[PDB]
Amino acid sequence: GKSTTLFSRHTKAIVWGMQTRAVQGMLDFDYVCSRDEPSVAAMVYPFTGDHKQKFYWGHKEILIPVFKNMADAMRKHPEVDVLINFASLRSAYDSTMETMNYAQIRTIAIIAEGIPEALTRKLIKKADQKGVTIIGPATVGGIKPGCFKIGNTGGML
Amino acid sequence: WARELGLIRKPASFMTSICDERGQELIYAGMPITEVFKEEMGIGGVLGLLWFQKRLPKYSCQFIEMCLMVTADHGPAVSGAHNTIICARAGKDLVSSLTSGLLTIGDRFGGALDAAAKMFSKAFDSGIIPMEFVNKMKKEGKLIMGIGHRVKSINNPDMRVQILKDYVRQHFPATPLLDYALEV
Amino acid sequence: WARELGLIRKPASFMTSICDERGQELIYAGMPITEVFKEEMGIGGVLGLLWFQKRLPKYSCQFIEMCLMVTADHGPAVSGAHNTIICARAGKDLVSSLTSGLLTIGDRFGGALDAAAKMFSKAFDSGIIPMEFVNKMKKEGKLIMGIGHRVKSINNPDMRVQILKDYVRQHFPATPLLDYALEVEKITTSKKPNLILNVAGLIGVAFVDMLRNCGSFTREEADEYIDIGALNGIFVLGRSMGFIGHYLDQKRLKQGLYRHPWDDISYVLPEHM
Amino acid sequence: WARELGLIRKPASFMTSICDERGQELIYAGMPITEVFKEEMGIGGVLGLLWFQKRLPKYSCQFIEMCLMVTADHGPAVSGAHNTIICARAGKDLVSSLTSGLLTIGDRFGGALDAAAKMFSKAFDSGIIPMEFVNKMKKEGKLIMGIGHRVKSINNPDMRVQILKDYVRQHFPATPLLDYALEVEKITTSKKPNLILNVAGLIGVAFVDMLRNCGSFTREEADEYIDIGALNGIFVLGRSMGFIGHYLDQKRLKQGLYRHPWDDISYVLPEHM
Amino acid sequence: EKITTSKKPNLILNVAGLIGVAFVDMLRNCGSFTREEADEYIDIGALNGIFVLGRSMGFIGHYLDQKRLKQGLYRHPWDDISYVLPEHM
Numbered sequence: 001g002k003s004t005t006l007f008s009r010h011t012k013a014i015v016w017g018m019q020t021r022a023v024q025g026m027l028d029f030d031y032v033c034s035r036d037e038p039s040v041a042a043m044v045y046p047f048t049g050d051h052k053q054k055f056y057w058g059h060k061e062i063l064i065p066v067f068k069n070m071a072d073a074m075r076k077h078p079e080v081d082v083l084i085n086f087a088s089l090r091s092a093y094d095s096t097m098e099t100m101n102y103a104q105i106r107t108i109a110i111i112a113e114g115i116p117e118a119l120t121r122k123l124i125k126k127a128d129q130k131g132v133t134i135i136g137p138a139t140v141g142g143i144k145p146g147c148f149k150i151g152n153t154g155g156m157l
Numbered sequence: 158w159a160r161e162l163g164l165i166r167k168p169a170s171f172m173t174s175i176c177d178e179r180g181q182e183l184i185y186a187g188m189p190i191t192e193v194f195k196e197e198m199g200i201g202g203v204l205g206l207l208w209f210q211k212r213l214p215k216y217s218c219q220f221i222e223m224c225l226m227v228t229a230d231h232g233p234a235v236s237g238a239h240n241t242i243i244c245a246r247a248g249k250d251l252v253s254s255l256t257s258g259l260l261t262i263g264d265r266f267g268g269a270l271d272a273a274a275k276m277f278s279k280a281f282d283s284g285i286i287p288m289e290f291v292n293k294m295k296k297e298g299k300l301i302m303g304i305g306h307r308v309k310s311i312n313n314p315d316m317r318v319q320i321l322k323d324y325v326r327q328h329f330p331a332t333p334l335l336d337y338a339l340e341v
Numbered sequence: 342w343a344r345e346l347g348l349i350r351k352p353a354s355f356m357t358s359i360c361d362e363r364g365q366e367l368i369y370a371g372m373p374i375t376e377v378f379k380e381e382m383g384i385g386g387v388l389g390l391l392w393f394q395k396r397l398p399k400y401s402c403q404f405i406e407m408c409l410m411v412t413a414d415h416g417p418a419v420s421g422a423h424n425t426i427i428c429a430r431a432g433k434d435l436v437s438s439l440t441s442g443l444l445t446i447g448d449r450f451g452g453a454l455d456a457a458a459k460m461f462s463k464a465f466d467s468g469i470i471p472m473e474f475v476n477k478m479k480k481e482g483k484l485i486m487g488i489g490h491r492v493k494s495i496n497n498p499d500m501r502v503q504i505l506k507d508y509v510r511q512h513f514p515a516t517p518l519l520d521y522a523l524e525v526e527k528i529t530t531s532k533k534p535n536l537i538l539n540v541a542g543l544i545g546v547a548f549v550d551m552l553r554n555c556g557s558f559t560r561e562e563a564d565e566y567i568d569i570g571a572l573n574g575i576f577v578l579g580r581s582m583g584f585i586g587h588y589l590d591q592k593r594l595k596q597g598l599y600r601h602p603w604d605d606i607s608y609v610l611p612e613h614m
Numbered sequence: 615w616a617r618e619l620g621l622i623r624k625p626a627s628f629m630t631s632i633c634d635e636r637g638q639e640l641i642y643a644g645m646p647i648t649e650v651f652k653e654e655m656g657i658g659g660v661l662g663l664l665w666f667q668k669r670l671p672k673y674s675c676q677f678i679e680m681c682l683m684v685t686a687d688h689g690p691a692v693s694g695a696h697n698t699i700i701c702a703r704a705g706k707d708l709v710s711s712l713t714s715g716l717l718t719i720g721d722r723f724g725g726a727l728d729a730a731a732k733m734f735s736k737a738f739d740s741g742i743i744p745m746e747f748v749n750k751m752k753k754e755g756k757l758i759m760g761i762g763h764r765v766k767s768i769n770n771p772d773m774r775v776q777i778l779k780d781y782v783r784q785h786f787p788a789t790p791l792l793d794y795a796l797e798v799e800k801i802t803t804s805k806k807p808n809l810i811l812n813v814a815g816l817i818g819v820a821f822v823d824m825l826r827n828c829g830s831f832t833r834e835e836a837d838e839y840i841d842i843g844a845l846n847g848i849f850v851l852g853r854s855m856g857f858i859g860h861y862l863d864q865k866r867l868k869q870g871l872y873r874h875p876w877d878d879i880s881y882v883l884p885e886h887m
Numbered sequence: 888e889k890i891t892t893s894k895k896p897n898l899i900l901n902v903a904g905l906i907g908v909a910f911v912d913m914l915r916n917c918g919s920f921t922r923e924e925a926d927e928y929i930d931i932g933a934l935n936g937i938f939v940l941g942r943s944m945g946f947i948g949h950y951l952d953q954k955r956l957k958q959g960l961y962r963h964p965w966d967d968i969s970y971v972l973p974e975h976m
């Protein structure tokens with residue numbers, strides 16, 4: 001069952017890939033929205049070891065964990081309910097399918113351009129089965145002013 | 158001026174957590190230097206503060222000092238001391254000679270400490286009995302790191318292994334890996 | 342005098358095969374220095390004699406000189422040049438500054454040469470097609486070393502990958518590993534344009550081709566020379582030129598001691614230990 | 615953002631003038647890398663651009679290459695090669711072994727280049743005749759650096775001093791300091807034959823002559839480059855080739871860890887302290 | 888130090904100068920050394936070795952801290968470097 005609400009002031013998301021500019025814009029949007037916590041809890045990048053990337057919370061310095069594996073990110077952050085998939089057209093399908101195995105993820109945002117229609121169709125079928133709302137691929141994402149921002153939606157600050 | 162007014166952001170390119178040079182007092186991983194000397198720390202305590210950021214007990218600091226004492230020198234025949242002497246006889250520098258000597262510290266010379274530690278830690282965590290560990294390392298073909306001397310065999314130990322071992326029995330609370338290594 | 346008359350037998354503790362100081366003439370790997378200069382080989386020929394004990398062809402020596410040239414320096418912002426400049430501004434020494442700069446030459450900085458060469462050689466020897474190699478690298482969470490550039494891409498090449506590549510095509514007899522790397526580059530540029538063959542990757546694959554394609558070496562010799570770190574020595578020798586240039590520039594500019602700003606450190610010391 | 619828009623103003627903590635990594639093309643002190651490869655300058659030209667920021671003539675670059683060639687390696691018995699071999703037989707690293715070998719250079723091993731150059735430059739600038747120079751050196755208990763060889767004296771010259779000297783006569787426009795050093799050599803050989811111009815002294819005087827005889831440099835620039843240790847860099851860069859060759863040779867021969875024998879150490883420790 | 892603080896208040900005996908003078912005193916005011924032995928040990932660089940050995944602890948601590956923090960490769964920003972390369976050489 002797809003919920004009628006997707007984003008709130010307590011929504012936590014996991015970003016797939018090195019998109020430090022997008023995540024920094026997300027954090028700036030959260031700060032100017034008077035959010036208690038940043039909307040990005042962790043990043044997933046398979047081509048590097050687990051570490052902490054340095055980001056800005058307003059003027060303060062914070063560290064956001066980066067995990068080589070998605071399973072570690074879902075394990076250590078059970079409060080995350082949104083995935084923002086920055087994988088390319090060759091990796092968006094597999095990343096989304098692997099994320100769908102985790103029941104904590106309720107909304108998946110796919111940014112990639114050029115995903116084959118069959119693969120997106122399969123993703124739609126599995127999302128309908130699992131009750132996961134997918135912000136369809138080839139999108140910038142979405143904005144909920146005061147609550148949450150997806151990727152680079154809304155431009156710069 | 159802009160930073161003082163809080164007008165701009167610039168991410169810091171570095172990150173340190175061992176020493177705080179700025180401020181009124183020098184700080185070693187949270188402990189001021191005056192508190193360092195009042196607590197009667199030694200080289201071991203300062204080493205623990207700078208390397209582990211921990212307030213080690215007195216016996217731990219004394220054991221670290223003893224380890225530094227026993228590894229101070231082992232003669233000029235080793236590779237590092239040889240290189241240091243070669244660079245010194247060239248009349249180069251203290252720093253350069255020390256550097257040339259220290260650059261030989263690696264797998265074959267000086268790396269037996271870390272290699273033995275990793276070897277015995279892996280063997281202990283694997284849960285295999287010491288006899289099984291010895292048989293496995295015989296069959297696989299790697300020498301057991303930290304085992305084997307040239308001339309001092311029995312009734313005449315290294316005699317600086319004895320000092321550290323006696324200290325560890327006397328002061329260390331629990332020594333499971335030491336007992337495993339002694340069984341090996 | 343006993344050694345002169347040979348009444349005693351003492352085995353030698355060392356063994357060298359690159360240079361012979363003793364005798365009426367200085368000898369480089371069995372060839373006199375005067376013969377070295379009459380043959381008109383340059384830095385590349387002496388490098389080949391000292392490192393491989395082989396009489397390399399003229400094009401191989403020129404290619405080695407080219408590789409030393411292109412890796413001479415890449416600005417002061419790299420780790421090694423930064424360390425050399427810091428040591429020079431401390432007024433220490435030429436040798437000490439070069440030393441401090443060269444000590445950063447390792448896996449993350451300067452080791453892309455050997456890593457790329459080893460990876461491409463392993464892929465070529467395994468017999469897998471370049472697409473299979475790309476997929477294998479992708480599924481193992483490993484980036485193809487020697488592939489990808491900062492700003493350069495297709496339709497805007499490196500301008501020093503191009504020169505070395507043109508020399509290799511014009512002069513090298515056969516370059517199978519270079520062709521394999523070019524197919525890999527063609528596959529990776531279809532993903533995003535900036536995924537072109539690096540200077541490190543191109544030099545590594547061309548050096549492997551020069552080792553295992555000229556008549557000087559056998560396959561075992563070339564593999565052993567790659568393993569022991571011949572390309573690491575190539576990069577170190579090339580970048581020492583730029584490091585010494587940095588030291589001389591810092592000395593000429595009379596720069597004072599460097600004292601890193603506090604506002605770029607972000608002390609994260611514990612509350613109380 | 616504030617720096618691009620020019621609202622703020624932050625002083626730069628570093629200054630460089632040898633290489634420009636940024637941009638669409640690598641630049642070696644004003645000259646693009648492609649242009650560096652167009653006029654066919656080699657190791658000498660790149661070295662001149664990086665160290666002196668000058669477009670040296672072809673003969674100067676070739677002479678620099680020759681100087682690197684003759685100082686490439688001089689056997690394993692020297693202190694630096696010995697240290698490199700010791701660090702290699704410990705199986706440490708290429709960079710570490712080269713580093714340990716290089717760290718011995720500067721005072722008694724490899725320091726004769728700069729010392730001889732400075733001594734002969736001071737003698738020539740002081741205006742004293744070579745005989746007065748020899749008398750002054752003798753009276754103050756100093757040996758002339760770069761004068762005096764081991765075995766090869768006359769009718770059998772160094773055979774690599776000869777190559778460089780012949781090149782200098784053939785291609786250098788004017789070499790007053792070389793003539794002064796040769797007069798000093800003529801005076802010293804009348805004392806005993808082995809008092810000839812060494813490769814260190816010959817290279818030093820010819821390098822000073824190249825610096826202050828080609829149109830690239832003024833007298834002040836040449837003097838400053840000599841003072842800051844250009845010849846030390848020349849020797850170190852040349853000998854790095856031989857040191858890396860020694861490391862590769864030791865790796866190829868698979869020599870084990872070296873420990874100096876006790877019968878050669880002669881412990882003189884005190885009775886009890 | 889009294890004279891220099893009379894000149895400017897922050898011209899105090901540094902830790903370097905204090906350690907140097909106290910180490911010279913320890914060398915030449917203890918029964919272990921004669922005056923020439925202390926002079927020779929000062930000349931050959933005993934305090935250089937003292938400083939190097941002391942600061943080695945801090946340098947190894949810095950290395951361990953950087954390894955534990957898993958800091959990535961450093962590249963100095965281009966805005967902090969002044970390129971004064973010649974027009975064309």
Ligand SMILES: CC(=O)SCCNC(=O)CCNC(=O)[C@H](O)C(C)(C)COP(=O)(O)OP(=O)(O)OC[C@H]1O[C@@H](n2cnc3c(N)ncnc32)[C@H](O)[C@@H]1OP(=O)(O)O
Pocket residue numbers: 267269270299300301302303304305306307
């Ligand atoms: C800093 C320090 O204190 S040094 C620390 C070095 N760490 C090590 O122990 C490395 C491995 N061991 C060694 O090399 C020992 O120090 C050495 C030098 C005594 C061994 O050198 P050797 O001359 O081979 O000793 P020895 O001749 O008695 O060894 C003979 C046999 O013992 C075995 N052996 C030697 N060392 C070890 C070891 N550490 N573990 C298991 N077996 C060993 C050898 O396999 C050899 O096999 P063999 O029975 O087929 O001949």
Ligand SMILES: CC(=O)SCCNC(=O)CCNC(=O)[C@H](O)C(C)(C)COP(=O)(O)OP(=O)(O)OC[C@H]1O[C@@H](n2cnc3c(N)ncnc32)[C@H](O)[C@@H]1OP(=O)(O)O
Pocket residue numbers: 418453484485486487488489490491492539540541542962963964965966
């Ligand atoms: C010898 C060689 O060519 S290095 C060989 C390396 N080979 C490999 O490891 C292959 C693996 N590939 C990779 O890791 C990557 O594809 C790379 C590193 C090769 C390509 O670089 P990227 O990952 O794009 O990062 P890059 O090095 O461009 O740096 C990021 C940005 O910082 C900028 N930057 C670089 N150096 C500096 C500096 N000193 N100061 C300020 N900014 C800088 C760059 O301009 C770049 O921005 P751009 O993309 O708009 O040009």
Ligand SMILES: CC(=O)SCCNC(=O)CCNC(=O)[C@H](O)C(C)(C)COP(=O)(O)OP(=O)(O)OC[C@H]1O[C@@H](n2cnc3c(N)ncnc32)[C@H](O)[C@@H]1OP(=O)(O)O
Pocket residue numbers: 600601602603604901902903904
């Ligand atoms: C080992 C030691 O104890 S140091 C030994 C030094 N040797 C000597 O004593 C030789 C003679 N002494 C001197 O030359 C001088 O008295 C010195 C250099 C020791 C001190 O003089 P100063 O220039 O006043 O000290 P310093 O250079 O640290 O001053 C820089 C100022 O910026 C600050 N500062 C220092 N380093 C940094 C940095 N990396 N980032 C930001 N700010 C800094 C300091 O707080 C200091 O404060 P101020 O603005 O009130 O002066």
Ligand SMILES: O=C([O-])CC(=O)C(=O)O
Pocket residue numbers: 228230231235266267
């Ligand atoms: O130097 C030491 O500590 C002793 C040593 O490694 C050896 O066994 O040769």
Ligand SMILES: O=C([O-])CC(=O)C(=O)O
Pocket residue numbers: 415419450451
């Ligand atoms: O290693 C080099 O050639 C320098 C380099 O690519 C960089 O880090 O900018």
Ligand SMILES: O=C([O-])CC(=O)C(=O)O
Pocket residue numbers: 684685687688689692723724813
């Ligand atoms: O002649 C050289 O090149 C330097 C050298 O090795 C020596 O003789 O000590």
